[PDB]
């Protein structure tokens, strides 16, 4: 839903890397290497943030009030 | 015995091994640069200072690796997330 | 009849991880020490989380859940607090926690990130570690919604909750060329060379060492950043030289009362 | 700049002098005497005529400015100190070119006589730890005591960049690279005046560790501030003379032909002229150059080389009596520089059946790097014979390396059999069964008796 906030089969902190990892796709790295600049080595890190679905951008379509 | 040729010349072409050999470069023991500090009679530095492209890699020591993360694969893809706007 | 001696070299030492390498020492001794790195070195961590207003997408467990996996800056302070089960004071106090707050309500269309940057301290050396990069994501907030809460921290092991654990991930490799022949590769030319492979391009493992012993041993302490990554070593030798010294108190206690 | 205004007794500076000729350096004195002029226009008019590229000049009026150092110009002694300094740190810069007529202690005792009286005014200035500080390098030791008086300058006044630059010199010595290029990277961001080039000896650190990248861009923009520098035309001959493979031509021609053109008085270019033109088969010309590539040289590791050099010119001719003595140099100079030396000693002291000392010096040899063909020089001059595993275990070793790689091997195998038929006879014989095809490809020639003897028996 949000972005795990550490890897879970490792530890490193993954939740403050979303947006920049969008960010870096925005910039049009490639897939992989917005993970090498994140600074992302273990594969257990990677899937991290590969394998995230970030649903809450859709949860966040609903209004509770406005 | 054996009447072996004794080694009196070289049939070797050890030439191969004179070639490769690194010349280190010692034309004056300063270093080819006269140390002293009343011969700096001009400067560069007046104040259309030079700074050239090729002068500013040397000034880095070691700065300048792979990227088999990109290599195109056909059984290999990419990734789709949350937009707002979709079918 | 008695101790090796250790020894020590640090290969490489950043602000996120140690490598280095104890030499003699044993096997046992070394994945012991790696245990302790994981398990036992002592963090500050969110462990409290009282929740007053909470209007997130994400239910209150949610959030609390995240908030303990945010780390802390406890560098310092992890050694000064005492464990809050053994604190006397019938409620969290500085001497035993760190107070958190959290306010934030998106009165804005454009949605706001809740972040670590959002946790505020009772005490500016327990901070989230991105405060001192960008900073963790706890929510994403509309137009409208707020989450309000007050959290402490407290000590506590990464044997207890892995909140606690300190580090992102222990390296820990000896014989790196199969000397010992405790791992027996079907077919050893498939195996890619470990970073610290001593051997040249052309063989593929070291002669078998029958007499040899695991004797060096190639650590990598990565940080999650709640300590330095030497902060990491020393305390995890700290802890568990500890340990055996109560272990020891408690034995000396059984035989004498014998 | 090109005339100044002269101070005269009356009419001051309504007179000048001029320095496109050249004038007497005779009569200067005597004219600056008479006229009275200030100490300033002493080191004005001695600044123009090192401007003309004139050393000596500058060097011989500056010295009878010492006597008139305060007649009656009211206490200018820091333009005396000033002057003084001049003549306490050019004789150092001057003793290193010496001429043929002079020696290098003739201006020692001249560098080290007049630096005393300099700081008799000012001591420990910006300039006088300079002086202390090079004249260790000149004797060839004390290179801790010149660093430490190098240091000195940066906590008193360090107020130009050469006043950092001795210490990457001396750390150069001590085979420190790392050190020196730390303190030769200051050189180029400020980059003050010198027509030495000062990115030259930049260029020459980034040749160790692998730094071919920097160094070629080092001697190029040398190239292009002064193509009158042969230190980083050279250079690049050294890069390439070991391409010896392709576009030979621009290493003899844009690499060795301009350099020696340009500047043919230099020992390291007349050396590697005579090493590629040995390759060429041109002898005539090799030893010309070799005999005027030694006689200027002073540090060994060139004249070593320029011996290794006569003595390969005399080696192919058949001439081993003018070439032992030749390596013997080359070896007495400069024994650590290279393996070449050792080598050229090991393969002439066949001669004359003093191969006992062969051994001993091809010894050395293996200390560096082993190779196919030093493997063969003692496996022939092998004196082990019979239960002798001193000389034996060496041979083994030797025919272990060219066993593996196949160098033509025609008698390799035979030099095997030889040594195992003490050891198990089923390698000699293996070895005599591979030796006895290995004699038929070359030419149809039949299998000499004594090979056919020894496998029999
Ligand atoms: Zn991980
Ligand atoms: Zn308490």
């Given at each position: 839903?949000?972005?795990?906030?550490?890897?879970?089969?490792?530890?490193?902190?993954?939740?403050?890397?979303?947006?920049?990892?969008?960010?870096?796709?925005?910039?049009?790295?490639?897939?992989?290497?917005?993970?090498?600049?994140?600074?992302?080595?273990?594969?257990?890190?990677?899937?991290?943030?590969?394998?995230?679905?970030?649903?809450?951008?859709?949860?966040?379509?609903?209004?509770?009030?406005? | 015995?054996?009447?072996?040729?004794?080694?009196?010349?070289?049939?070797?072409?050890a030439?191969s091994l004179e070639?490769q050999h690194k010349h280190?470069?010692?034309?004056?023991?300063?270093?080819?640069?006269?140390?002293?500090?009343?011969?700096?009679?001009?400067?560069?530095?007046?104040?259309?200072?030079?700074?050239?492209?090729?002068?500013?890699?040397?000034?880095?020591?070691?700065?300048?690796?792979?990227?088999?993360?990109?290599?195109?694969?056909?059984?290999?893809?990419?990734?789709?997330?949350?937009?707002?706007?979709?079918? | 009849?008695?101790?090796?001696?250790?020894?020590?070299?640090?290969?490489?030492?950043?602000?996120?991880?140690?490598?280095?390498?104890?030499?003699?020492?044993?096997?046992?001794?070394?994945?012991?020490?790696?245990?302790?790195?994981?398990?036992?070195?002592?963090?500050?961590?969110?462990?409290?989380?009282?929740?007053?207003?909470?209007?997130?997408?994400?239910?209150?467990?949610?959030?609390?859940?995240?908030?303990?996996?945010?780390?802390?800056?406890?560098?310092?302070?992890?050694?000064?607090?005492?464990?809050?089960?053994?604190?006397?004071?019938?409620?969290?106090?500085?001497?035993?926690?760190?107070?958190?707050?959290?306010?934030?309500?998106?009165?804005?269309?454009?949605?706001?990130?809740?972040?670590?940057?959002?946790?505020?301290?009772?005490?500016?050396?327990?901070?989230?570690?991105?405060?001192?990069?960008?900073?963790?994501?706890?929510?994403?907030?509309?137009?409208?919604?707020?989450?309000?809460?007050?959290?402490?921290?407290?000590?506590?092991?990464?044997?207890?909750?892995?909140?606690?654990?300190?580090?992102?991930?222990?390296?820990?490799?000896?014989?790196?060329?199969?000397?010992?022949?405790?791992?027996?590769?079907?077919?050893?030319?498939?195996?890619?060379?470990?970073?610290?492979?001593?051997?040249?391009?052309?063989?593929?493992?070291?002669?078998?060492?029958?007499?040899?012993?695991?004797?060096?041993?190639?650590?990598?302490?990565?940080?999650?950043?709640?300590?330095?990554?030497?902060?990491?070593?020393?305390?995890?030798?700290?802890?568990?030289?500890?340990?055996?010294?109560?272990?020891?108190?408690?034995?000396?206690?059984?035989?004498?009362?014998? | 700049?090109?005339?100044?205004?002269?101070?005269?007794?009356?009419?001051?500076?309504?007179?000048?002098?001029?320095?496109?000729?050249?004038?007497?350096?005779?009569?200067?004195?005597?004219?600056?005497?008479?006229?009275?002029?200030?100490?300033?226009?002493?080191?004005?008019?001695?600044?123009?005529?090192?401007?003309?590229?004139?050393?000596?000049?500058?060097?011989?009026?500056?010295?009878?400015?010492?006597?008139?150092?305060?007649?009656?110009?009211?206490?200018?002694?820091?333009?005396?100190?000033?002057?003084?300094?001049?003549?306490?740190?050019?004789?150092?810069?001057?003793?290193?070119?010496?001429?043929?007529?002079?020696?290098?202690?003739?201006?020692?005792?001249?560098?080290?006589?007049?630096?005393?009286?300099?700081?008799?005014?000012?001591?420990?200035?910006?300039?006088?730890?300079?002086?202390?500080?090079?004249?260790?390098?000149?004797?060839?030791?004390?290179?801790?005591?010149?660093?430490?008086?190098?240091?000195?300058?940066?906590?008193?006044?360090?107020?130009?960049?050469?006043?950092?630059?001795?210490?990457?010199?001396?750390?150069?010595?001590?085979?420190?690279?790392?050190?020196?290029?730390?303190?030769?990277?200051?050189?180029?961001?400020?980059?003050?005046?010198?027509?030495?080039?000062?990115?030259?000896?930049?260029?020459?650190?980034?040749?160790?560790?692998?730094?071919?990248?920097?160094?070629?861009?080092?001697?190029?923009?040398?190239?292009?501030?002064?193509?009158?520098?042969?230190?980083?035309?050279?250079?690049?001959?050294?890069?390439?003379?070991?391409?010896?493979?392709?576009?030979?031509?621009?290493?003899?021609?844009?690499?060795?032909?301009?350099?020696?053109?340009?500047?043919?008085?230099?020992?390291?270019?007349?050396?590697?002229?005579?090493?590629?033109?040995?390759?060429?088969?041109?002898?005539?010309?090799?030893?010309?150059?070799?005999?005027?590539?030694?006689?200027?040289?002073?540090?060994?590791?060139?004249?070593a080389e320029?011996?290794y050099?006569?003595?390969?010119?005399?080696?192919?001719?058949?001439?081993?009596?003018?070439?032992?003595?030749?390596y013997?140099?080359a070896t007495?100079?400069a024994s650590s520089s290279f393996v070449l030396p050792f080598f050229g000693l090991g393969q002439?002291?066949?001669?004359?059946?003093?191969?006992?000392?062969?051994?001993?010096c091809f010894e050395k040899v293996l200390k560096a790097y082993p190779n196919?063909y030093e493997?063969?020089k003692?496996?022939?001059?092998?004196?082990?014979?019979?239960?002798?595993?001193?000389?034996?275990?060496?041979?083994?070793?030797?025919?272990?390396?060219?066993?593996?790689?196949?160098?033509?091997?025609?008698?390799?195998?035979?030099?095997?059999?030889?040594?195992?038929?003490?050891?198990?006879?089923?390698?000699?014989?293996?070895?005599?069964?591979?030796?006895?095809?290995?004699?038929?490809?070359?030419?149809?020639?039949?299998?000499?008796?004594?090979?056919?003897?020894?496998?029999?028996?």
């Amino acid at each position: 839903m949000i972005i795990p906030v550490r890897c879970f089969t490792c530890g490193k902190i993954v939740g403050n890397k979303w947006e920049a990892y969008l960010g870096l796709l925005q910039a049009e790295y490639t897939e992989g290497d917005a993970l090498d600049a994140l600074g992302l080595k273990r594969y257990c890190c990677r899937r991290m943030l590969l394998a995230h679905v970030d649903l809450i951008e859709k949860l966040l379509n609903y209004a509770p009030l406005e | 015995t054996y009447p072996f040729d004794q080694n009196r010349f070289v049939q070797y072409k050890a030439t191969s091994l004179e070639k490769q050999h690194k010349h280190d470069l010692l034309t004056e023991p300063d270093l080819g640069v006269t140390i002293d500090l009343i011969n700096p009679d001009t400067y560069r530095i007046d104040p259309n200072v030079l700074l050239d492209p090729a002068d500013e890699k040397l000034l880095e020591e070691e700065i300048q690796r792979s990227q088999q993360h990109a290599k195109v694969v056909p059984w290999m893809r990419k990734t789709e997330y949350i937009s707002t706007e979709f079918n | 009849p008695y101790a090796n001696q250790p020894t020590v070299r640090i290969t490489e030492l950043t602000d996120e991880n140690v490598k280095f390498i104890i030499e003699n020492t044993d096997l046992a001794v070394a994945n012991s020490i790696r245990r302790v790195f994981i398990a036992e070195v002592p963090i500050i961590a969110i462990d409290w989380v009282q929740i007053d207003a909470n209007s997130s997408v994400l239910h209150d467990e949610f959030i609390a859940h995240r908030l303990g996996l945010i780390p802390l800056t406890s560098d310092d302070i992890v050694d000064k607090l005492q464990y809050s089960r053994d604190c006397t004071c019938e409620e969290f106090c500085p001497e035993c926690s760190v107070e958190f707050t959290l306010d934030v309500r998106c009165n804005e269309d454009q949605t706001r990130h809740v972040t670590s940057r959002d946790l505020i301290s009772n005490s500016p050396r327990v901070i989230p570690v991105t405060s001192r990069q960008d900073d963790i994501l706890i929510v994403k907030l509309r137009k409208g919604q707020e989450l309000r809460l007050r959290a402490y921290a407290k000590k506590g092991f990464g044997k207890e909750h892995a909140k606690w654990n300190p580090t992102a991930g222990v390296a820990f490799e000896y014989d790196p060329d199969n000397a010992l022949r405790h791992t027996v590769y079907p077919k050893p030319e498939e195996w890619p060379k470990s970073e610290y492979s001593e051997l040249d391009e052309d063989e593929s493992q070291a002669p078998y060492d029958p007499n040899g012993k695991p004797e060096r041993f190639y650590y990598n302490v990565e940080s999650c950043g709640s300590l330095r990554p030497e902060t990491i070593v020393l305390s995890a030798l700290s802890g568990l030289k500890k340990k055996l010294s109560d272990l020891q108190t408690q034995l000396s206690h059984e035989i004498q009362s014998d | 700049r090109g005339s100044i205004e002269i101070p005269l007794r009356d009419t001051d500076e309504v007179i000048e002098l001029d320095f496109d000729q050249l004038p007497e350096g005779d009569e200067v004195i005597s004219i600056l005497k008479q006229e009275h002029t200030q100490l300033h226009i002493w080191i004005a008019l001695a600044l123009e005529y090192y401007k003309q590229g004139k050393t000596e000049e500058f060097v011989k009026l500056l010295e009878a400015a010492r006597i008139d150092g305060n007649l009656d110009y009211r206490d200018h002694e820091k333009d005396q100190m000033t002057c003084l300094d001049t003549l306490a740190a050019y004789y150092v810069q001057q003793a290193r070119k010496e001429k043929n007529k002079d020696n290098k202690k003739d201006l020692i005792t001249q560098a080290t006589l007049l630096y005393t009286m300099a700081d008799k005014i000012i001591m420990y200035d910006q300039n006088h730890l300079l002086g202390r500080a090079c004249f260790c390098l000149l004797e060839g030791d004390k290179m801790d005591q010149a660093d430490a008086q190098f240091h000195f300058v940066l906590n008193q006044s360090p107020n130009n960049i050469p006043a950092l630059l001795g210490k990457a010199c001396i750390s150069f010595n001590k085979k420190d690279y790392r050190g020196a290029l730390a303190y030769y990277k200051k050189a180029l961001r400020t980059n003050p005046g010198c027509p030495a080039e000062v990115r030259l000896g930049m260029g020459h650190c980034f040749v160790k560790l692998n730094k071919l990248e920097k160094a070629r861009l080092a001697f190029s923009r040398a190239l292009e501030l002064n193509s009158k520098c042969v230190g980083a035309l050279v250079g690049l001959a050294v890069l390439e003379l070991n391409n010896k493979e392709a576009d030979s031509i621009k290493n003899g021609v844009q690499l060795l032909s301009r350099a020696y053109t340009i500047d043919p008085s230099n020992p390291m270019v007349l050396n590697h002229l005579a090493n590629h033109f040995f390759f060429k088969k041109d002898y005539s010309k090799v030893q010309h150059l070799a005999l005027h590539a030694f006689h200027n040289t002073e540090v060994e590791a060139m004249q070593a080389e320029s011996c290794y050099q006569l003595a390969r010119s005399f080696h192919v001719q058949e001439d081993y009596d003018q070439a032992f003595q030749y390596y013997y140099q080359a070896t007495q100079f400069a024994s650590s520089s290279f393996v070449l030396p050792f080598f050229g000693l090991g393969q002439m002291y066949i001669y004359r059946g003093d191969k006992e000392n062969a051994s001993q010096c091809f010894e050395k040899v293996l200390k560096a790097y082993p190779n196919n063909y030093e493997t063969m020089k003692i496996l022939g001059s092998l004196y082990a014979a019979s239960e002798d595993q001193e000389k034996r275990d060496i041979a083994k070793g030797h025919l272990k390396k060219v066993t593996e790689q196949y160098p033509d091997d025609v008698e390799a195998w035979i030099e095997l059999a030889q040594i195992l038929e003490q050891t198990d006879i089923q390698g000699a014989l293996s070895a005599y069964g591979t030796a006895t095809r290995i004699l038929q490809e070359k030419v149809q020639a039949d299998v000499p008796p004594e090979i056919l003897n020894n496998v029999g028996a």
